[PDB]
Design a protein around this ligand. Structure first.
Ligand code: NI
Length: 149
């Protein structure tokens, strides 16, 4: 076999079960998703309350299942607005026990420049690109268009 086939094994056995965003200031739920937004090769949509834009810090929980072991599960997220990369995020989970279900908690501190951009301009015009890696092995690329309601 090969690295390309190993990545497909991990991808085949991977699932995002649920995700939520909390206002880190209060711990109150902003947003809750149950769609597997890790599914690649298509565009997804997420409808998020516009109040998220005025949060200095959001607490994300991603709950995921992996049939395959991963040595160093990490994410690279790029926020695109009108073709322009506004923000770059790097998150690391680390070691994933095979046949495990895990909650990955991340504090996400938005650029202050992003906090004052109007919801009416961002809505429908923002793509989050997520690259799922095992160390340097790219497992999948997923795309979610954001609406701020
Ligand atoms: Ni081989």
């Amino acid at each position: 076999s090969a690295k390309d086939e190993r990545a497909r094994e991990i991808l085949r056995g991977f699932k995002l079960n649920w995700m939520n965003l909390r206002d880190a200031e209060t711990g109150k739920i902003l947003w809750q998703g149950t769609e597997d937004l890790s599914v690649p090769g298509v565009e997804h949509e997420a409808r998020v309350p516009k109040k998220i834009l005025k949060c200095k810090a959001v607490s994300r929980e991603l709950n995921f299942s992996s049939t395959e072991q991963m040595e160093k599960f990490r994410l690279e997220q790029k926020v695109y607005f009108k073709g322009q990369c506004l923000e770059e995020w790097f998150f690391e989970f680390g070691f994933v026990i095979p046949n495990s279900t895990n909650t990955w908690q991340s504090l996400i501190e938005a650029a202050p420049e992003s906090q004052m951009m109007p919801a009416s301009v961002l809505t429908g015009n923002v793509i989050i690109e997520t690259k799922f890696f095992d160390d340097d092995l790219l497992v999948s690329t997923s795309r979610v268009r954001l609406f701020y309601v």
